Amino acid sequence: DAQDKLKYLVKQLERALRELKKSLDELERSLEELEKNPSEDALVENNRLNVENNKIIVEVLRIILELAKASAKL
Amino acid sequence: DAQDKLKYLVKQLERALRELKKSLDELERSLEELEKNPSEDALVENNRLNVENNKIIVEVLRIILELAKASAKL
Amino acid sequence: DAQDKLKYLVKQLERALRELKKSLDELERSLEELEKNPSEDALVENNRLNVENNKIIVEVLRIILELAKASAKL
Numbered sequence A, B, C: 001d002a003q004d005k006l007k008y009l010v011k012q013l014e015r016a017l018r019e020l021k022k023s024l025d026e027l028e029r030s031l032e033e034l035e036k037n038p039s040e041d042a043l044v045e046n047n048r049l050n051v052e053n054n055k056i057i058v059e060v061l062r063i064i065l066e067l068a069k070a071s072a073k074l
Protein backbone atom coordinates (compact mmCIF):
# COMPACT_ATOMS: atom_id res chain seq x y z
CA ASP A 1 0.00 0.00 0.00
CA ALA A 2 2.96 2.34 0.66
CA GLN A 3 3.76 3.19 -2.98
CA ASP A 4 0.12 3.88 -3.83
CA LYS A 5 -0.47 6.06 -0.80
CA LEU A 6 2.69 8.02 -1.76
CA LYS A 7 1.19 8.73 -5.15
CA TYR A 8 -1.99 9.97 -3.52
CA LEU A 9 -0.04 12.24 -1.10
CA VAL A 10 1.84 13.65 -4.07
CA LYS A 11 -1.49 14.60 -5.69
CA GLN A 12 -2.60 16.23 -2.45
CA LEU A 13 0.66 18.23 -2.45
CA GLU A 14 0.08 19.44 -5.99
CA ARG A 15 -3.44 20.57 -5.07
CA ALA A 16 -2.29 22.46 -2.00
CA LEU A 17 0.50 24.17 -3.93
CA ARG A 18 -2.00 25.38 -6.48
CA GLU A 19 -3.95 26.96 -3.55
CA LEU A 20 -0.72 28.49 -2.14
CA LYS A 21 0.17 30.00 -5.52
CA LYS A 22 -3.23 31.63 -5.87
CA SER A 23 -2.82 33.03 -2.38
CA LEU A 24 0.66 34.36 -3.13
CA ASP A 25 -0.71 36.16 -6.21
CA GLU A 26 -3.38 37.84 -4.07
CA LEU A 27 -0.73 38.82 -1.51
CA GLU A 28 1.55 40.38 -4.11
CA ARG A 29 -1.35 42.41 -5.57
CA SER A 30 -2.11 43.64 -2.07
CA LEU A 31 1.50 44.75 -1.64
CA GLU A 32 1.41 46.64 -4.97
CA GLU A 33 -1.70 48.54 -3.85
CA LEU A 34 -0.09 49.22 -0.48
CA GLU A 35 3.06 50.60 -2.05
CA LYS A 36 0.94 52.81 -4.29
CA ASN A 37 -1.40 54.28 -1.65
CA PRO A 38 -0.17 53.40 1.85
CA SER A 39 -2.74 53.63 4.63
CA GLU A 40 -3.64 51.85 7.83
CA ASP A 41 -6.41 50.00 5.99
CA ALA A 42 -4.10 48.80 3.26
CA LEU A 43 -1.61 47.70 5.86
CA VAL A 44 -4.10 45.58 7.78
CA GLU A 45 -5.33 43.93 4.59
CA ASN A 46 -1.84 43.21 3.50
CA ASN A 47 -1.09 41.56 6.88
CA ARG A 48 -4.29 39.58 6.67
CA LEU A 49 -3.23 38.13 3.40
CA ASN A 50 0.31 37.43 4.62
CA VAL A 51 -1.09 35.53 7.62
CA GLU A 52 -3.39 33.57 5.35
CA ASN A 53 -0.46 32.69 3.14
CA ASN A 54 1.54 31.41 6.16
CA LYS A 55 -1.44 29.32 7.26
CA ILE A 56 -1.52 27.56 3.87
CA ILE A 57 2.25 26.99 4.04
CA VAL A 58 1.75 25.16 7.34
CA GLU A 59 -0.88 22.97 5.67
CA VAL A 60 1.53 22.20 2.87
CA LEU A 61 4.21 21.27 5.42
CA ARG A 62 1.80 18.94 7.15
CA ILE A 63 1.42 17.03 3.86
CA ILE A 64 5.20 16.83 3.47
CA LEU A 65 5.43 15.28 6.97
CA GLU A 66 2.90 12.66 5.85
CA LEU A 67 5.03 12.04 2.74
CA ALA A 68 8.11 11.68 5.00
CA LYS A 69 6.32 9.14 7.21
CA ALA A 70 5.14 7.16 4.15
CA SER A 71 8.72 7.06 2.82
CA ALA A 72 10.20 6.03 6.19
CA LYS A 73 8.23 2.78 6.07
CA LEU A 74 9.92 1.59 2.88
CA ASP B 1 22.28 3.67 9.46
CA ALA B 2 20.27 5.49 6.76
CA GLN B 3 16.82 4.08 7.66
CA ASP B 4 17.30 4.77 11.37
CA LYS B 5 18.52 8.30 10.86
CA LEU B 6 15.46 8.90 8.62
CA LYS B 7 13.20 7.88 11.47
CA TYR B 8 14.99 10.29 13.79
CA LEU B 9 14.70 13.16 11.25
CA VAL B 10 11.00 12.43 10.96
CA LYS B 11 10.64 12.85 14.74
CA GLN B 12 12.53 16.13 14.55
CA LEU B 13 10.11 17.27 11.83
CA GLU B 14 7.10 16.43 13.96
CA ARG B 15 8.57 18.42 16.87
CA ALA B 16 9.28 21.46 14.74
CA LEU B 17 5.80 21.39 13.22
CA ARG B 18 4.29 21.39 16.68
CA GLU B 19 6.33 24.59 17.37
CA LEU B 20 5.20 26.12 14.02
CA LYS B 21 1.54 25.38 14.81
CA LYS B 22 1.76 27.07 18.19
CA SER B 23 3.34 30.06 16.51
CA LEU B 24 0.66 30.20 13.83
CA ASP B 25 -2.02 30.24 16.55
CA GLU B 26 -0.33 33.19 18.23
CA LEU B 27 -0.08 34.98 14.87
CA GLU B 28 -3.75 34.50 14.08
CA ARG B 29 -4.77 35.83 17.52
CA SER B 30 -2.60 38.87 16.86
CA LEU B 31 -4.37 39.45 13.54
CA GLU B 32 -7.80 39.21 15.23
CA GLU B 33 -6.78 41.88 17.76
CA LEU B 34 -5.36 44.02 14.97
CA GLU B 35 -8.55 43.80 12.93
CA LYS B 36 -10.54 44.75 16.02
CA ASN B 37 -8.49 47.76 17.18
CA PRO B 38 -5.96 48.75 14.50
CA SER B 39 -3.03 50.85 15.67
CA GLU B 40 0.65 51.25 14.95
CA ASP B 41 1.46 49.17 18.02
CA ALA B 42 -0.79 46.33 16.97
CA LEU B 43 0.71 46.45 13.51
CA VAL B 44 4.28 46.13 14.72
CA GLU B 45 3.38 43.23 16.99
CA ASN B 46 1.57 41.49 14.23
CA ASN B 47 4.64 41.85 11.96
CA ARG B 48 6.89 40.61 14.72
CA LEU B 49 4.89 37.47 14.99
CA ASN B 50 4.72 37.00 11.21
CA VAL B 51 8.53 37.29 11.01
CA GLU B 52 8.90 34.79 13.83
CA ASN B 53 6.60 32.41 12.02
CA ASN B 54 8.69 32.68 8.81
CA LYS B 55 11.86 32.02 10.82
CA ILE B 56 10.40 28.74 12.13
CA ILE B 57 9.31 27.77 8.59
CA VAL B 58 12.94 28.13 7.46
CA GLU B 59 14.00 25.83 10.30
CA VAL B 60 11.42 23.30 9.23
CA LEU B 61 12.71 23.49 5.64
CA ARG B 62 16.23 22.89 6.84
CA ILE B 63 15.05 19.59 8.36
CA ILE B 64 13.35 18.62 5.10
CA LEU B 65 16.66 19.20 3.25
CA GLU B 66 18.33 16.83 5.73
CA LEU B 67 15.55 14.30 5.05
CA ALA B 68 16.14 14.75 1.29
CA LYS B 69 19.89 14.13 1.70
CA ALA B 70 19.25 11.02 3.84
CA SER B 71 16.88 9.66 1.16
CA ALA B 72 19.31 10.41 -1.70
CA LYS B 73 21.82 7.97 -0.21
CA LEU B 74 19.48 4.99 -0.52
CA ASP C 1 18.10 8.34 -14.21
CA ALA C 2 15.94 8.70 -11.07
CA GLN C 3 18.78 8.57 -8.49
CA ASP C 4 20.90 11.07 -10.40
CA LYS C 5 18.07 13.52 -10.92
CA LEU C 6 17.35 13.28 -7.16
CA LYS C 7 20.90 14.34 -6.43
CA TYR C 8 20.52 17.30 -8.76
CA LEU C 9 17.20 18.34 -7.12
CA VAL C 10 18.89 18.15 -3.74
CA LYS C 11 21.55 20.61 -4.96
CA GLN C 12 18.83 22.91 -6.25
CA LEU C 13 17.19 22.76 -2.79
CA GLU C 14 20.43 23.70 -1.07
CA ARG C 15 20.85 26.68 -3.40
CA ALA C 16 17.33 27.92 -2.82
CA LEU C 17 17.66 27.59 0.94
CA ARG C 18 20.79 29.70 0.85
CA GLU C 19 18.69 32.40 -0.94
CA LEU C 20 15.87 32.01 1.65
CA LYS C 21 18.32 32.40 4.54
CA LYS C 22 19.75 35.60 3.10
CA SER C 23 16.23 36.91 2.69
CA LEU C 24 15.29 35.99 6.26
CA ASP C 25 18.33 37.91 7.53
CA GLU C 26 17.23 41.00 5.61
CA LEU C 27 13.69 40.61 6.98
CA GLU C 28 14.87 40.36 10.58
CA ARG C 29 17.04 43.48 10.19
CA SER C 30 14.00 45.29 8.84
CA LEU C 31 11.98 44.25 11.89
CA GLU C 32 14.73 45.50 14.25
CA GLU C 33 14.67 48.92 12.55
CA LEU C 34 10.88 48.95 12.67
CA GLU C 35 10.81 48.16 16.37
CA LYS C 36 13.34 50.93 16.97
CA ASN C 37 11.68 53.72 14.96
CA PRO C 38 8.16 52.68 13.91
CA SER C 39 6.66 54.60 11.00
CA GLU C 40 4.42 53.96 8.02
CA ASP C 41 7.48 53.78 5.78
CA ALA C 42 9.20 51.22 7.96
CA LEU C 43 6.02 49.21 8.07
CA VAL C 44 5.63 49.04 4.31
CA GLU C 45 9.26 48.03 3.86
CA ASN C 46 8.94 45.38 6.46
CA ASN C 47 5.85 43.96 4.69
CA ARG C 48 7.64 44.08 1.37
CA LEU C 49 10.39 41.95 2.73
CA ASN C 50 7.97 39.54 4.42
CA VAL C 51 6.13 39.07 1.10
CA GLU C 52 9.41 38.49 -0.68
CA ASN C 53 10.35 35.90 1.90
CA ASN C 54 7.03 34.05 1.39
CA LYS C 55 7.57 34.10 -2.38
CA ILE C 56 10.93 32.33 -1.96
CA ILE C 57 9.34 29.78 0.40
CA VAL C 58 6.85 28.90 -2.35
CA GLU C 59 9.77 28.38 -4.75
CA VAL C 60 11.43 26.11 -2.24
CA LEU C 61 8.19 24.12 -1.87
CA ARG C 62 7.98 23.73 -5.61
CA ILE C 63 11.39 22.01 -5.54
CA ILE C 64 10.24 19.71 -2.74
CA LEU C 65 7.24 18.67 -4.89
CA GLU C 66 9.68 17.80 -7.69
CA LEU C 67 11.71 15.78 -5.16
CA ALA C 68 8.50 14.01 -4.07
CA LYS C 69 7.62 13.14 -7.68
CA ALA C 70 11.16 11.83 -8.33
CA SER C 71 10.93 9.63 -5.22
CA ALA C 72 7.46 8.31 -6.12
CA LYS C 73 8.87 6.72 -9.27
CA LEU C 74 11.25 4.46 -7.35
Ligand SMILES: N[C@]12C[C@H]3C[C@H](C[C@H](C3)C1)C2
Pocket: A064, A067, A068, A071, B064, B067, B068, B071, C064, C067, C068, C071
Ligand atom coordinates in the same frame (compact mmCIF):
# COMPACT_ATOMS: atom_id res chain seq x y z
N1 LIG D 1 11.51 11.41 0.17
C1 LIG D 1 11.12 12.76 0.55
C2 LIG D 1 10.82 13.57 -0.72
C3 LIG D 1 10.37 14.98 -0.35
C4 LIG D 1 11.52 15.67 0.39
C5 LIG D 1 11.87 14.87 1.67
C6 LIG D 1 10.64 14.83 2.58
C7 LIG D 1 9.47 14.13 1.84
C8 LIG D 1 9.13 14.93 0.58
C9 LIG D 1 9.87 12.72 1.43
C10 LIG D 1 12.26 13.45 1.32
Ligand code: NA
Pocket: A046, A047, A050, B046, B047, B050, C046, C047, C050
Ligand atom coordinates in the same frame (compact mmCIF):
# COMPACT_ATOMS: atom_id res chain seq x y z
NA1 NA E 1 3.15 42.42 7.83
